[PDB]
């Protein structure tokens, strides 16, 4: 077809990669995966209810936390419905349905339709209490009145999807290596290391003889491995590495058709920088010109209970109780394996059990499959996301193991998917094959719910733009999604892509008008405005969805308010009009636009923050973190949400006291001067003690607590919040000025500080109840979000931070010391940031 080719060229520009391309291939897994994904796509497309799809009610089935019940002291809730300008308030009970409110309106007042929130593409529809809508719980928590317009359901037809119509030792022959341009050092020796890998576990290892490092090195050696051919498990990687460690590539021993991989290969390798997820990719380097290569030959068809004593059961259960980062001894492993059936009765044993498996042994693998045949206990246990994530990490390369984890995820309501989506997407980096239960799960869930669908797009596009290690895989997944999201969403994405391309192609030019002499002259700010007013007319779209808040529709630029800012990089501060006529307020949408940092680390941190909040919700705690919108759109560059009416703490202090200097009161004065009534001031000191506590606990746990005061902000209403997670010591930032607000000054105790301490201990202990989930997220963040990181140095930090294996009193004691360490030195580390600027 011809109207199918434009559509392909449409999808390419949306994706940022061309998936028809075959240049960087050596087999057909990608195309196979495109074809494979058609079925599950169409199964979810055919399945979804058009009506509920179009309106995508954002809904939860969690209870309602104690601290928001207190905010409805009457079993009634106030909703204000509108038409033109005609408006009326309605008495509603928490258990009322959108259905039970329409008649409480129509049958109540006379002189079909649906309830949409003012200023947003967000709806209150479907069989759910209003108390179980997200927009409603937000309105409460924020002290805000719910505002909603009456109009029609949006036409489901707008979401019309288009139309698609042996038994011997294994051997590998190393021929040679070659880099087109060598020049680097008195080149040491150089050898090839050939690992047979499965789940980061090396099953077998052979090397070449060491030879000189010229731009062409040879061997012609057959390397014989200890493993037999029938002993190879599906998912096994031939991992080929160059030491002198500087280069790596991987080739799957068994392909997507269960065939043993045979023949000649010329593989272009990746270079080490200066363990992590990049080291695992089946993708070869596409830069065939600059990159080191390797040549190999494969010639080698398809794939082929009683009662336990006492003290051992104790020993077993000790092992099972232990944390995800506890090393399993050989003794521990054999214990688990020999008593696998007894181990199978404990859903928590599963990770340690399945890493007690000798995957290099064919007959044991089989027994493990038989073992997985009786899933009774597993299938009936409640969802433990933490358990499930463990099975999706770099430690498991077996499809059956991985699929039981994907099975458990099915029972997640879309609310919870949204919480774990970034990390489920990053977990895709740990899949041996392009077609996985996990990729498909993301596809299904993505297409069933537009909100998920939106974030799935941006999450995948972030990686496609930024890493060659996985861009091909993620691109095939993105195409699968785009092919079913609907014409309405395709148009939307198109809008959004245009805008950010246009806007980034302005962040560049501007940044190069001063390298390090930051000082934004009139010559700079004016030409910025000239670009935008040029853009406004005949290129920049009418209205785009705010990528980090798909609810809000942004309209026209407000040129006058735009700027560059004092930052040592040069980020755009941009403000937009809302395109929604019904918008309750006339306030602008602020979006920062920043080039120079890798925003994916900021994404991973923010999202764990949201997780940490919901974790706290489970125990009726609120720490009012402000996890600001932040989306990585392209390479080294992406957008951020402007929190209105906030300023940096350092910037606050550089208004009263010189520049090099500090002083302790200025925070509290700044608060009193920006809050009108001394009550709204107390509402601010309130907000401060909670927000402060939260960022202290969260921050310590992730070991990102030692920050320079310019990296912490506060709102005009008391809410403190860390920013720019782009990358002697202090556990967190609790400085004298903070303490001054709490009614304390250098080594004493006060009622707000007594509270502060109290809420901290309570917040900490709460996270400790979810220890395992946090350990796995952290290490996955480390493996999929950074350069190189250590498998017991970087990660093993969080065991200690969360104080694994302690009684609550120890834990509380431990944390309260950290509070006191910050006390000792108060301004010490702070001052140092400026001292280093000369040492
Ligand atoms: C009014 C105001 O300053 N609002 C803001 N709110 C937020 C969350 C801001 C923010 C958040 C993150 C980042 Cl990364 C930045 S930034 O201006 O790009 N970086 C400055 C380095 O410290 C600014 S700026």
From Swiss-Prot:
Q: State the tissue distribution.
A: Pancreas, skeletal muscle, liver and heart.
Gene Ontology terms: cellular component: cytoplasm; cytosol; membrane; phosphatidylinositol 3-kinase complex, class IA; phosphatidylinositol 3-kinase complex, class IB; plasma membrane
Query: Could you share any additional remarks the record makes about this protein?
Result: Candidate target in therapy for inflammatory diseases. Selective inhibitors and protein ablation are anti-inflammatory in multiple disease models such as asthma, rheumatoid arthritis, allergy, systemic lupus erythematosus, airway inflammation, lung injury and pancreatitis.
Identify the residues that the record assigns to the PIK helical domain, covering every copy. 305-484
Q: Which InterPro entries match?
A: ARM-type_fold, C2_domain_sf, Kinase-like_dom_sf, PI3/4_kinase_cat_dom, PI3/4_kinase_cat_sf, PI3/4_kinase_CS, PI3K-type_C2_dom, PI3K_ABD
Q: State where it is primarily located.
A: cytoplasm
Gene designation per UniProt = PIK3CG
Q: Which Pfam families match?
A: PI3_PI4_kinase (PF00454), PI3K_C2 (PF00792), PI3K_rbd (PF00794), PI3Ka (PF00613), PIK3CG_ABD (PF19710)
Protein name stated in the entry: Phosphatidylinositol 4,5-bisphosphate 3-kinase catalytic subunit gamma isoform
Q: Where is this region: Catalytic loop?
A: 703-711
């Amino acid at each position: 077809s011809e109207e199918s080719q434009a559509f392909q060229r449409q999808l390419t520009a949306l994706i940022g990669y061309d998936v028809t391309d075959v240049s960087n291939v050596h087999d057909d897994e990608l195309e196979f995966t495109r074809r494979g994904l058609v079925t599950p796509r169409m199964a979810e497309v055919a399945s979804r209810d058009p009506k509920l799809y179009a309106m995508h009610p954002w809904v939860t089935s969690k209870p309602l936390p104690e601290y928001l019940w207190k905010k409805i002291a009457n079993n009634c809730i106030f909703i204000v419905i509108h038409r033109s300008t005609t408006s009326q308030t309605i008495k509603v009970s928490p258990d009322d349905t959108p259905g039970a409110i329409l008649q409480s309106f129509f049958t109540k007042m006379a002189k079909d339709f649906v309830l949409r929130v003012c200023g947003r593409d967000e709806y209150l529809v479907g069989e759910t209490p209003i108390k179980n809508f997200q927009w409603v719980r937000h309105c409460l928590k924020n002290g805000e009145e719910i505002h909603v317009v009456l109009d029609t359901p949006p036409d489901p037809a707008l979401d019309e999807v288009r139309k698609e119509e042996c038994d011997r030792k294994f051997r590998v022959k190393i021929r040679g290596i070659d880099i087109p341009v060598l020049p680097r050092n008195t080149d040491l020796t150089v050898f090839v290391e050939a690992n047979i890998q499965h789940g980061q576990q090396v099953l077998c290892q052979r090397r070449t003889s060491p030879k000189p490092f010229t731009e062409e090195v040879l061997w012609n050696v057959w390397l014989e491995f200890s493993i037999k051919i029938k002993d190879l498990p599906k998912g096994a990687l031939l991992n080929l590495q160059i030491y002198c460690l500087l280069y790596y590539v991987n080739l799957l021993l068994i392909d997507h058709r269960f065939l043993l991989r045979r023949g000649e290969y010329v593989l272009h390798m990746w270079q080490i920088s200066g363990f992590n997820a990049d080291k695992l990719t089946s993708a070869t380097n596409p830069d065939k010109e600059n990159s080191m290569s390797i040549s190999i030959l494969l010639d080698n068809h398809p794939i082929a209970r009683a009662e336990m004593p006492n003290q051992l059961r104790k020993q077993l259960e000790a092992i099972i109780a232990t944390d995800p980062l506890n090393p399993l001894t050989a003794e521990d492993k054999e214990l688990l394996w020999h008593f696998r059936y007894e181990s199978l009765k404990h859903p928590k044993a599963y990770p340690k059990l399945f890493s007690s498996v000798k995957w290099g042994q064919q007959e044991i693998v089989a027994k493990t499959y038989q073992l997985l045949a009786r899933r009774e206990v597993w299938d009936q246990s409640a969802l433990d996301v933490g358990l499930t994530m463990q099975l999706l990490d770099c430690n498991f390369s077996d499809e059956n193991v991985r699929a039981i984890a994907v099975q458990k995820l099915e029972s997640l309501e879309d609310d919870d998917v949204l919480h774990y989506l970034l990390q489920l997407v990053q977990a895709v980096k740990f899949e041996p094959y392009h077609d996985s239960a996990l990729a498909r799960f993301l596809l299904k869930r993505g297409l069933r719910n537009k909100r998920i669908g939106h974030f799935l797009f941006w999450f995948l596009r972030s990686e496609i733009a930024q890493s060659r290690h996985y861009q091909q895989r993620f691109a095939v997944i993105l195409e699968a999604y785009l092919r079913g999201c609907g014409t309405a969403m395709l148009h939307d994405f198109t809008q959004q892509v245009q805008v950010i391309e246009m806007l980034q192609k302005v962040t560049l030019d501007i940044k190069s008008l001063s390298a390090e002499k930051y000082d934004v002259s009139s010559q700079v700010i004016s030409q910025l405005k000239q670009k935008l007013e040029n853009l406004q007319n005949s290129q920049l779209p009418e209205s785009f969805r705010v990528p980090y808040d798909p609810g809000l529709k942004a309209g026209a630029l407000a040129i006058e308010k735009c700027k560059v800012m004092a930052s040592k990089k040069k980020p755009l501060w941009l403000e937009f009009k809302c395109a929604d006529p019904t918008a309750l307020s006339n306030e602008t949408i602020g979006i920062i636009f920043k080039h120079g940092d890798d925003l994916r680390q900021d994404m991973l941190i923010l999202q764990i923050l949201r997780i940490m909040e919901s974790i706290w919700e489970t125990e009726s705690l609120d720490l009012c973190l402000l996890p600001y919108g932040c989306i990585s759109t392209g390479d080294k560059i992406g957008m951020i949400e402007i929190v209105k009416d906030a300023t940096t703490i350092a910037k606050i202090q550089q208004s009263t006291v010189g520049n090099t200097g500090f002083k302790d009161e200025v925070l509290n004065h700044w608060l009193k001067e920006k809050s009108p009534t001394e009550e709204k001031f107390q509402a601010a000191v309130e907000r401060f003690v909670y927000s402060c506590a939260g960022y202290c606990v969260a921050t310590f746990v992730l070991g990102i607590g030692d920050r320079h005061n310019d990296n912490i902000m506060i709102t005009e209403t008391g809410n403190l919040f860390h920013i720019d997670f782009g990358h002697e010591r202090v556990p967190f930032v609790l400085t004298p000025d903070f303490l001054f607000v709490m009614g304390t000054s250098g080594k004493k105790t006060s009622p707000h500080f007594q509270k502060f301490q109290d809420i901290c201990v309570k917040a900490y202990l709460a996270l400790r109840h979810h220890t395992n989930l946090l350990i796995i997220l952290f290490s996955m963040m480390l493996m999929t979000g950074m350069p190189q990181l250590t498998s017991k140095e970087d990660i093993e930090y969080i065991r200690d931070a969360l104080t694994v294996g302690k009684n609550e009193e120890d834990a509380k004691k431990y944390f309260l010391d950290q509070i006191e360490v910050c006390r000792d030195k108060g301004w010490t580390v702070q001052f140092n940031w400026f001292l280093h600027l000369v040492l």
